[PDB]
Design an enzyme around this catalytic site. Structure first.
Site, PDB file in Angstrom:
ATOM      1  N   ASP A 197      20.164 -19.325   8.708  1.00 13.84           N
ATOM      2  CA  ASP A 197      18.923 -20.056   8.811  1.00 13.84           C
ATOM      3  C   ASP A 197      18.927 -20.850  10.134  1.00 13.84           C
ATOM      4  O   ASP A 197      19.980 -21.350  10.564  1.00 13.84           O
ATOM      5  CB  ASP A 197      18.899 -21.048   7.635  1.00 13.84           C
ATOM      6  CG  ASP A 197      17.779 -22.039   7.719  1.00 13.84           C
ATOM      7  OD1 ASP A 197      16.621 -21.606   7.600  1.00 13.84           O
ATOM      8  OD2 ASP A 197      18.053 -23.263   7.907  1.00 13.84           O
ATOM      9  N   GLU A 233      18.144 -15.856  11.735  1.00  6.34           N
ATOM     10  CA  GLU A 233      16.728 -16.246  11.866  1.00  6.34           C
ATOM     11  C   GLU A 233      16.445 -16.881  13.223  1.00  6.34           C
ATOM     12  O   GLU A 233      16.788 -18.051  13.450  1.00  6.34           O
ATOM     13  CB  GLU A 233      16.274 -17.211  10.753  1.00  6.34           C
ATOM     14  CG  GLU A 233      14.744 -17.434  10.786  1.00  6.34           C
ATOM     15  CD  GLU A 233      14.300 -18.899  10.706  1.00  6.34           C
ATOM     16  OE1 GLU A 233      15.105 -19.833  10.959  1.00  6.34           O
ATOM     17  OE2 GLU A 233      13.096 -19.115  10.431  1.00  6.34           O
TER      18      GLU A 233
HETATM   19  C1  LIG Z   1      12.377 -33.468   7.070  1.00  2.00           C
HETATM   20  C2  LIG Z   1      11.282 -32.409   7.131  1.00  2.00           C
HETATM   21  O1  LIG Z   1      11.274 -31.733   5.865  1.00  2.00           O
HETATM   22  C3  LIG Z   1      10.328 -30.680   5.715  1.00  2.00           C
HETATM   23  O2  LIG Z   1      10.659 -29.584   6.593  1.00  2.00           O
HETATM   24  C4  LIG Z   1      10.788 -28.338   5.910  1.00  2.00           C
HETATM   25  C5  LIG Z   1       9.902 -27.298   6.592  1.00  2.00           C
HETATM   26  O3  LIG Z   1       8.536 -27.672   6.548  1.00  2.00           O
HETATM   27  C6  LIG Z   1      10.121 -25.919   5.954  1.00  2.00           C
HETATM   28  O4  LIG Z   1       9.435 -24.939   6.703  1.00  2.00           O
HETATM   29  C7  LIG Z   1      11.622 -25.574   5.893  1.00  2.00           C
HETATM   30  O5  LIG Z   1      12.273 -25.141   6.979  1.00  2.00           O
HETATM   31  C8  LIG Z   1      13.274 -24.118   6.897  1.00  2.00           C
HETATM   32  C9  LIG Z   1      14.197 -24.312   8.078  1.00  2.00           C
HETATM   33  C10 LIG Z   1      14.965 -25.609   8.174  1.00  2.00           C
HETATM   34  O6  LIG Z   1      16.157 -25.395   7.405  1.00  2.00           O
HETATM   35  C11 LIG Z   1      14.361 -23.370   9.025  1.00  2.00           C
HETATM   36  C12 LIG Z   1      13.562 -22.072   8.982  1.00  2.00           C
HETATM   37  N1  LIG Z   1      12.566 -21.774   9.784  1.00  2.00           N
HETATM   38  C13 LIG Z   1      12.184 -22.672  10.896  1.00  2.00           C
HETATM   39  C14 LIG Z   1      12.715 -22.190  12.253  1.00  2.00           C
HETATM   40  O7  LIG Z   1      14.122 -22.012  12.163  1.00  2.00           O
HETATM   41  C15 LIG Z   1      12.437 -23.221  13.356  1.00  2.00           C
HETATM   42  O8  LIG Z   1      12.810 -22.658  14.630  1.00  2.00           O
HETATM   43  C16 LIG Z   1      10.971 -23.686  13.371  1.00  2.00           C
HETATM   44  O9  LIG Z   1      10.143 -22.630  13.913  1.00  2.00           O
HETATM   45  C17 LIG Z   1       9.417 -22.964  15.090  1.00  2.00           C
HETATM   46  C18 LIG Z   1       9.714 -21.894  16.155  1.00  2.00           C
HETATM   47  O10 LIG Z   1      11.089 -21.859  16.516  1.00  2.00           O
HETATM   48  C19 LIG Z   1       8.829 -22.112  17.384  1.00  2.00           C
HETATM   49  O11 LIG Z   1       8.984 -21.051  18.306  1.00  2.00           O
HETATM   50  C20 LIG Z   1       7.351 -22.207  16.983  1.00  2.00           C
HETATM   51  O12 LIG Z   1       6.932 -20.965  16.448  1.00  2.00           O
HETATM   52  O13 LIG Z   1       7.170 -23.212  16.003  1.00  2.00           O
HETATM   53  C21 LIG Z   1       7.902 -22.958  14.809  1.00  2.00           C
HETATM   54  C22 LIG Z   1       7.442 -23.946  13.740  1.00  2.00           C
HETATM   55  O14 LIG Z   1       7.792 -25.248  14.133  1.00  2.00           O
HETATM   56  O15 LIG Z   1      10.527 -24.014  12.046  1.00  2.00           O
HETATM   57  C23 LIG Z   1      10.676 -22.936  11.064  1.00  2.00           C
HETATM   58  C24 LIG Z   1      10.003 -23.330   9.745  1.00  2.00           C
HETATM   59  C25 LIG Z   1      13.538 -21.748   7.483  1.00  2.00           C
HETATM   60  O16 LIG Z   1      13.128 -20.405   7.217  1.00  2.00           O
HETATM   61  C26 LIG Z   1      12.583 -22.756   6.869  1.00  2.00           C
HETATM   62  O17 LIG Z   1      12.144 -22.397   5.541  1.00  2.00           O
HETATM   63  O18 LIG Z   1      12.358 -26.622   5.283  1.00  2.00           O
HETATM   64  C27 LIG Z   1      12.244 -27.840   5.994  1.00  2.00           C
HETATM   65  C28 LIG Z   1      13.303 -28.770   5.422  1.00  2.00           C
HETATM   66  O19 LIG Z   1      12.909 -29.177   4.139  1.00  2.00           O
HETATM   67  C29 LIG Z   1       8.919 -31.221   5.936  1.00  2.00           C
HETATM   68  O20 LIG Z   1       8.008 -30.121   5.857  1.00  2.00           O
HETATM   69  C30 LIG Z   1       8.822 -31.933   7.289  1.00  2.00           C
HETATM   70  O21 LIG Z   1       7.524 -32.518   7.425  1.00  2.00           O
HETATM   71  C31 LIG Z   1       9.901 -33.021   7.409  1.00  2.00           C
HETATM   72  N2  LIG Z   1       9.855 -33.641   8.731  1.00  2.00           N
HETATM   73 CL   LIG Z   2      13.910 -14.922   7.707  1.00  3.22          CL
END
Ligand SMILES: C[C@H]1O[C@H](O[C@H]2[C@H](O)[C@@H](O)[C@@H](O[C@@H]3C(CO)=C[C@H](N[C@H]4[C@H](O)[C@@H](O)[C@@H](O[C@H]5[C@H](O)[C@@H](O)[C@@H](O)O[C@@H]5CO)O[C@@H]4C)[C@H](O)[C@H]3O)O[C@@H]2CO)[C@H](O)[C@@H](O)[C@@H]1N
Ligand SMILES: [Cl-]
Ligand SMILES: [Ca+2]
Length: 496
Positions: A197, A233
């Site tokens: 992840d 990922e």
């Molecule tokens: C404290 C925090 O809590 C909550 O956050 C949650 C997220 O909303 C959920 O989506 C989830 O995140 C998972 C995670 C973290 O473990 C990682 C994954 N996917 C990520 C990815 O790895 C990141 O790189 C990023 O993507 C960005 C891209 O890299 C950029 O190129 C561009 O496209 O923007 C994107 C989006 O920002 O974010 C992805 C979601 C994994 O698959 C996810 O499921 O869980 C967290 C933790 O609970 C609250 O929502 C937030 O408000 C709080 N601040």
């Molecule tokens: Cl994935």
């Protein structure tokens, strides 16, 4: 790290998102093994913060409190039971590894966790690991907020807090060792590999250093010297300094361009059409086939999280979704992962789903069992895409045609297309606003074939459409544009 470790003749994984371990174990035995599924991606098995505002969101599982195997999916005993039972029927388990971070820095201290471990985010105290303030990147990060502010800066992307999630100091041997301990516990239980992840948020060399500490796979099920399958990922859609290719040394990488583009094509948006799929794969600018982990939707983007994208197809758009999944499973590019979801009350306000946080079907926070309806669909609001005939029979199609070349392509210059996989399978799609009626070269031996989209082969007959291939390999296909499933697939094992 590139080999899936699946049983010979099995070519896909299904993500059983938020399913309980006892339900996955039964599913392995009663359905996934006999239907030829390769393996199951499971939700993070380690202890996480129990988040009560909002109420038990799916994303609480991405906020670790410790590496104890104790979650809403079940305890360590049930996790072990599941991995054993699945391997014993030739179905592998792949773990979602949450290793970049612990929980959000603003989470209140206490024992609001899935195994009741104490933790204190404000003091960087996670004694059930243990981690302390010395084990996080607070001194390394150079942003004013301490959080990631700018994806154009590759350094802050790795050293700063993703959305405030406490960022582990993966440069330190102690931290790498605690993570490897966790992963070796899973490997020894019998896990076949890992979804890493938030890989973009770790240095490729820190991931390497952790992987270097890992055991070979359990030698009761896996040949001696077997290494865990690794898929990372990384969301790379272009325009950023970090590239999916930066992670090839460690394993396969998620190809998020795949579902974004396929959704656009199947929706016929942005001037796109199925005839353009002739050169699908590296021809569309995607990564090498032997490194891609591909999928139509994932748990993030089916609800607008991650990179999101309006074009993403999901179970909510059922007719087009089955077509997209069918094309993916027929085409040779990549290693294929099928999503299996639950329903939630989608509610749009200002273009956004205000219920994108909702967790799995539950009774006051307790995850509901997966019930099986008489027609083999699921109850309790589990969608079970992987049990839809049209998707399950395509999972077998991919197995049957494994290793066969992309051949015998046809298109009408719009959205009526067809292709074969050597002499072992053939598939035909109509996504135009008129009937597809034509005799095509299939590459198949002569005979009567069951269409595995509309029906199944049973005791020498078909329950759906029959296709008649003549001595020269040709067969007539007729698909109305108003067909509920406007595609047909036949293969070596569907022949009468
Ligand atoms: C404290 C925090 O809590 C909550 O956050 C949650 C997220 O909303 C959920 O989506 C989830 O995140 C998972 C995670 C973290 O473990 C990682 C994954 N996917 C990520 C990815 O790895 C990141 O790189 C990023 O993507 C960005 C891209 O890299 C950029 O190129 C561009 O496209 O923007 C994107 C989006 O920002 O974010 C992805 C979601 C994994 O698959 C996810 O499921 O869980 C967290 C933790 O609970 C609250 O929502 C937030 O408000 C709080 N601040
Ligand atoms: Cl994935
Ligand atoms: Ca990091």
């Amino acid at each position: 790290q590139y080999s899936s470790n699946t049983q010979q003749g099995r070519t896909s994984i299904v993500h059983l998102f938020e399913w309980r371990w006892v339900d996955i174990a039964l599913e392995c035995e009663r359905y996934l093994a006999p239907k030829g599924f390769g393996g199951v991606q499971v939700s993070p098995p380690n202890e996480n913060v129990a988040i009560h505002n909002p109420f038990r969101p799916w994303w609480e599982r991405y906020q670790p409190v410790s590496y104890k195997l104790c979650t809403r999916s079940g305890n360590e005993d049930e996790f072990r039971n599941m991995v054993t039972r699945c391997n014993n029927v030739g179905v592998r388990i792949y773990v979602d590894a949450v290793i970049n971070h612990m929980c959000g820095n603003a989470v209140s201290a206490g024992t609001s966790s899935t195994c009741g471990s104490y933790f204190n985010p404000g003091s960087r105290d996670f004694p059930a690991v243990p981690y302390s303030g010395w084990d996080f990147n607070d001194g390394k990060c150079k942003t004013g907020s301490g959080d990631i502010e700018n994806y154009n800066d590759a350094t802050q992307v790795r050293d700063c807090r993703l959305s405030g999630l406490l960022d582990l100091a993966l440069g330190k041997d102690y931290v790498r060792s605690k993570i490897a301990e966790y992963m070796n516990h899973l490997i020894d239980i019998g896990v076949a590999g890992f979804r890493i992840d938030a890989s973009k948020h770790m240095w490729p060399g820190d991931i390497k250093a952790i992987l270097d500490k890992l055991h070979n796979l359990n030698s009761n099920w896996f040949p001696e010297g077997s290494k865990p399958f690794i898929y990372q990922e990384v969301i790379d859609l272009g325009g950023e300094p970090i590239k999916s290719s930066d992670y090839f040394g460690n394993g396969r990488v998620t190809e998020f361009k795949y579902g974004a583009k396929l959704g656009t094509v199947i929706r016929k948006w942005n001037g796109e059409k199925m005839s353009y799929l002739k050169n699908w794969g590296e021809g569309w600018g995607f990564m090498p086939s032997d490194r891609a982990l591909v999928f139509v939707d994932n748990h993030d983007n089916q609800r607008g999280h991650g990179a999101g994208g309006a074009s993403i197809l999901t179970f909510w758009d059922a007719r087009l979704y089955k077509m997209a999944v069918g094309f993916m499973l027929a085409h040779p590019y990549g290693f294929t992962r099928v999503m299996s979801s639950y329903r939630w009350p989608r509610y749009f306000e200002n273009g956004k789903d205000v219920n994108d946080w909702v967790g799995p079907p539950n009774d006051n926070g307790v995850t509901k069992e997966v019930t099986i309806n008489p027609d083999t669909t699921c109850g309790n609001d589990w969608v079970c895409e992987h049990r839809a005939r049209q998707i399950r029979n395509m999972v077998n199609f991919r197995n049957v045609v494994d290793g066969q070349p992309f051949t015998n392509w046809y298109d009408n210059g719009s959205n009526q297309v067809a292709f074969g996989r050597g002499n072992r399978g053939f598939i035909v799609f109509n996504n135009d606003d008129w009937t597809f009626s034509l005799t095509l070269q299939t590459g198949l031996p002569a005979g009567t074939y069951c269409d595995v989209i509309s029906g199944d082969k049973i005791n020498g007959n078909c329950t759906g459409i029959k296709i008649y291939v003549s001595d020269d390999g040709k067969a007539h296909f007729s698909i109305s544009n108003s067909a509920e499933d406007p595609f047909i697939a036949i293969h070596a094992e569907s022949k009468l």
